[model samples]
Target chain A: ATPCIKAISPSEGWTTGGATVIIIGDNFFDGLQVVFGTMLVWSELITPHAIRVQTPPRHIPGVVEVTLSYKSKQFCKGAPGRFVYTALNEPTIDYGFQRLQKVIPRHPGDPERLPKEVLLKRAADLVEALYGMPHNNQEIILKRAADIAEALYS
Target chain B: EATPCIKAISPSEGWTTGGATVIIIGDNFFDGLQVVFGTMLVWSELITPHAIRVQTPPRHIPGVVEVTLSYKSKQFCKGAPGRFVYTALNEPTIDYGFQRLQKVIPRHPGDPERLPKEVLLKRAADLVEALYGM
Candidate 1:
């Protein structure tokens, strides 16, 4: 039986990997393996319609297709789930952080240049709180962060 | 040194709308250590090797999420990870607050039919401050 992947929840993650993701689809069975690009990952069958797998680390940031495999034969060649890997230092993401740094809430005695981690977390908080489900695309995230920061600080 | 791990999260529960400050009490923490909320990696502040501060990210629904640490693309605290609970907003109170404010809150030309939640909260706070300050 051929298992088709309908969607990958969250759809994006860090390049560091290890994000638990669910593969939602049909025709899943025990022992069917999940692949991120060419890397075979361990998977658990939640049901015939779902499988859980941890993402594999990738050095480069980009999109990768998620597919099912069994005994060397591949599935979902025509239709596969797409997962985007984001790097913390990538220009777009870094730029977003930079924009947020200027307008995020400031506290007494806070440093002149806040830590990058602090910027990311704060921006993420506003983005998450307002948007509910964060968009997977970096540009969309950046635009929202900038807009929210401007509105808050103005 | 022992591998970094999370022992506990202080005030681990927050509204699903997120932006709650929390402390991660743990061991072997250090500068550059990162915290993960479910699959989303977040920024963390290292107060000491035993403590870190983080703002809980928003979740679309009320539930629990596994919190872990990472460094150099390597993840830690899998065997003993920290957990955070996301509770949904107390709709009755906040919703009522919004409903009451909606009548008095200032509006601008070309404003949308429904103001976004952020705008609503912002405007409401501004009105509250103006009323009490004067």
Candidate 2:
């Protein structure tokens, strides 16, 4: 009925911002403004299901809720899109992949330790399945993916 | 227990009007298995043990829906289901254009939920006039 955000591609970026991000959602229209946290940013409506926006700079490295604004009213607060900011000195998403590499399920003929790229791809696949729907539970879904993968392997 | 699997969905995205022929490629496929787009089940043609052809069902809303297989009450690809995205076209029809204008047009005080069609027309004309006048 109303506008909603499904996912934000390349969900993480440097705190310095300026990375072009694609906002995937439904019921979007022209003049539907994109907001990262409290700051409004320029947005282009590519289609009813897609919007392109530039990430806004943040002071600290953390998560910000991305929502849509129209005529001073905001939408999708309950299921707002999420973007993670990584400081230059931070461990970054690759570090998380490194940690998962040690524990993710392994198949026969696989190397003793998984490659980082393979680890990320599998983790990404599982995360997409768990959070593929238009749900507001990415944080929990991410944890569940890891739990499911570990359970399957163990 | 062995179960049907979905490795890929050919042409995974399509217009919301549906009727797009999609190929589901996977493993352990069998006869009498049905394909589902979200909750709506459509008739599927089993091409082989690894492929099934099915038409996408119409969806009013444009977004992502999980694609999976069903046989009897048992479902497959819960952990790794295929995904299909529905897109709505910005058609150039008169009704569609009005719908587009209705959304982005400025809302003044005392506007009703069913906004006056006459006022919308006047405002829309003014918008075009301004654009051309500039």
Candidate 3:
């Protein structure tokens, strides 16, 4: 009918956020913004039928009413799309964390298995620290092993 | 020596236009009992002790519609009946989109490498939505 969501992609994501998601529906336009459980994800218009957005952090796991809005005009409040946020404590994050653990960089002398907090920090730091990549005057070698050892284990 | 009970409904959601063939998976089903989707009742077929199949009926608008069974003047699943979502999009669009989704959605750990079509659609909808937004 009017602008309404038929569905969403990656219906669930970490409550910690920073993941992108998509909405597939009809009547999407230049002015419309996508709502994932009351919080507006700034939308990028992909087509008259699709919109993309990055998720925001949520407190827990559950389904959210994903609606569309344009200023005062609203669409599909009752039949809005559904988006689920995975709680940090949920098994989805547990699975995702498990996936990350095996894939991130490893430092020798570190335990056979790195704890989740250390894995999380290093993966995030990889984005900033470049994984001890030699940049001008930067020396973060030893893979931050001893550095994160104290922070994570202690 | 157990009474028939419904455990779950698959593809419980459909457009307000209804007509989605839904599977009722439960225990101890009966041929005598008929399925109901809100006020609209339809033909149901028993597949096994654990399952039955039925078609949905058209509704006025979008919302959660209760699904239950009736047999010999007694209604079942009254307090917590199966739920069907009537969405804004109608039948053809929903069915086609659902068909389109089954191929690309991600599978969970315990899931089949290729999940059922219904699961594919649901997971696909969510995965594509997540991927497209960013």
Candidate 4:
């Protein structure tokens, strides 16, 4: 049967292994295999409704379809699951800043968009104040960037 | 440590069969914690280090008490949590039609706060006929 993949946890992550990937689906059974691109992965069957898998090392940076295969039959895209691998050299900060720029609100009489430098500076200040430590967490940094954008807009 | 609790809930009103996304802003939030709405206990993910996302439970109650963080036997941030007042939005009021109209009508970049009653009624009439007409 065609299983519906309702959601993916840790929706995005590094290309390296060890990230916990939770797949919410239906009709899952034992001996199930998850694949990223063409590589089969180590998958732990959680239940008939969920499966947890780990990402594998990737040769390049891009999104690969993750699919499930069981009993010699492919379930997703007639194959397996896919994941997007991002390159290490890509500026994580810029990627985060761009995403924040889209969703964060804008304020009246404010410039159309805040410059990257301003975003970084304000982010640094907020991080210092919020956590009392330097910002290192990617998720936290992204949220801070969005918060800064919202303040600018508001 | 005591896990944070709900400090305040915005809007304060929702359908009797609650499914509205309510913002519960408070303190002492950590991962793997949840917010309880009436009898339903909802697992909330920390949106910000301080903020959390909670889906209201499905039943109606006069109010809800914010619970503390406890898994196994460990207690979370040991401090005062918050409370929420749950009021059902079932009564008909003025601008009810306008509220319904906003959802159906197209919204532009800049639109007035309130549309004319006639304009809303006309659009609503068209929408009902279009959906229900044989």
Candidate 5:
């Protein structure tokens, strides 16, 4: 079967390493393992089209390639997914927002620098607008508020 | 039997040739109704338990005017119904770039402005290349 990795969520994260990364692709099945350099970290198969893996402990701060290995067959050869690991002292919120802004949808006539409140409100409103409501609805509201606060301070 | 009373409209302003969505909030509203703007009749759709969406009617007058809601019996809200202000869509000035390229540019008949950025750039490049060398 022809398998290809489309995209990776939270493409970059801190070297402290404890973030859930979702991989979207096709033909992903059981026995899928995430390879960070030579270290093999097993991944949980969320669905046929997705996989969730935790970032491994970093030996050093910088960018590294993450690849998927299933049944001894390594996809993308040596170079696969790319992730950035920052120094532990480096600020987290700024780094996180920079990663998120790429995936967020922007509107016409929106200002260049979006205010923290507007970003938070719009993000919350979009979720509410699309999903009709959220599961554990209160959690979504709280999460959105936290994201806004992070944006404000960062 | 509680009769409906008009409280206030969130946005009391709309197009004079009227086809703007207006949200009406009040008390004691029920099924079978109509919102009257002067002599023109506009229908309303219930949005929530307390709110209804009404379309405003075309107005010759520009300023604020009294709006009323009626069902079985004509209940003119006591001295204070709701007020709506009518405004017209203003025409915008055309940019020189758009003006010079309007004729050759592909345009939808009903579009209010110039062609989209991609289309404009492509057409302009084609026109320039045809007039000048590659």
Candidate 6:
């Protein structure tokens, strides 16, 4: 009989392929290989229904079918699990956390402040994660930086 | 006695259908104390007087959840423990964000052909915000 896949945890990840993903299913055994689309990753058999794995990077962004196969025996062919690959710089709305970092209260026992470059990167990552780049113009870039700094930091 | 009150949680929000390492931060923490995310009780390991590490249990829905601590049967920290955001989309890491931005941001001449990703994201995010009126 073939194994059945019920769900995958952190079912979405980046194209960079380093995030650890947990696979939950039934009829699993040790030595069975886990596949992410066509890419194979390191997997450990935890039990008859669970496996832990690290993902591989894909060249593009999209969803990939996560399946299992062993010695030519394929499993979960019909109920294959899916993992979504998200691109951070999707140019969605806008970006700002580092700008706002000054305002967003830091946890206790932390340093007094971060260098400006660290601040820029942190702010950019938060902005990209939450909003994506709005558009490339001088005024709104600085302007929204101010607004976003307020919205998130405050 | 602090009664094991909670002040914060790192990576506070994870998938409601959860399997994530959460760091509970606050005061009066001690061994043998139990942690709760929403209504679910979790196996907790105490790392310090102010921190307890726990694995979150799964939830069917998405929303904010109050995290707290308890010992024996008495619960504590409901008034002001911490908040975790249960998001619909799984959040990406900082490195992942930088990689995606590196592929899409614009370029300028006389710059290192392989520009610093941070610089690109800074400029790219500015352009995006400017475009959308953020």
Best by DockQ: 6
Ranked by lDDT, the better of candidates 2 and 6 is 2
On the 0 to 100 scale, the lDDT of residue B31 in model 4 is 77
Give DockQ: model 2.
Answer: 0.02
Candidate 1 residue A54 Cα shift, in angstroms, is 0.4
Residue pairs in candidate 1 whose N, alpha carbon or C atoms collide under 3 angstroms: none
Model 2 scores a TM of: 0.33
Candidate 6 residue B105 C-alpha distance from true site, Å: 22
lDDT of 3 at A13: 76
What tens-digit string does per-residue lDDT give for candidate 3 at B1-134? Answer: 55666656655555566666666755667777788877677878775455567887777877788888888877777877877776653345434443344433333469765555434322222222222212
lDDT of 5 at B30: 71
DockQ (0 to 1) for model 4: 0.02
CA lDDT, candidate 3, residue B56: 77
Which residue segments of model 5 deviate by more than 4 Å?
A: A1-154, B89-134
* Candidate 5 Cα deviation (angstroms), residue A49: 43
Model 4 segments more than 4 A misplaced: A78-82, A89-154, B1-134
Interface RMSD of each: 16.3, 24.9, 18.3, 21.9, 22.8, 13.1
Q: Scored by Cα lDDT, where does model 1 land? A: 0.66
Model 1: lDDT of residue A70: 89
| 5 or 6, greater by lDDT | 6
lDDT of each: 0.66, 0.65, 0.59, 0.50, 0.56, 0.62
The 10-residue segment of model 5 chain B with minimum total lDDT is B125-134
lDDT of 4 at B3: 46
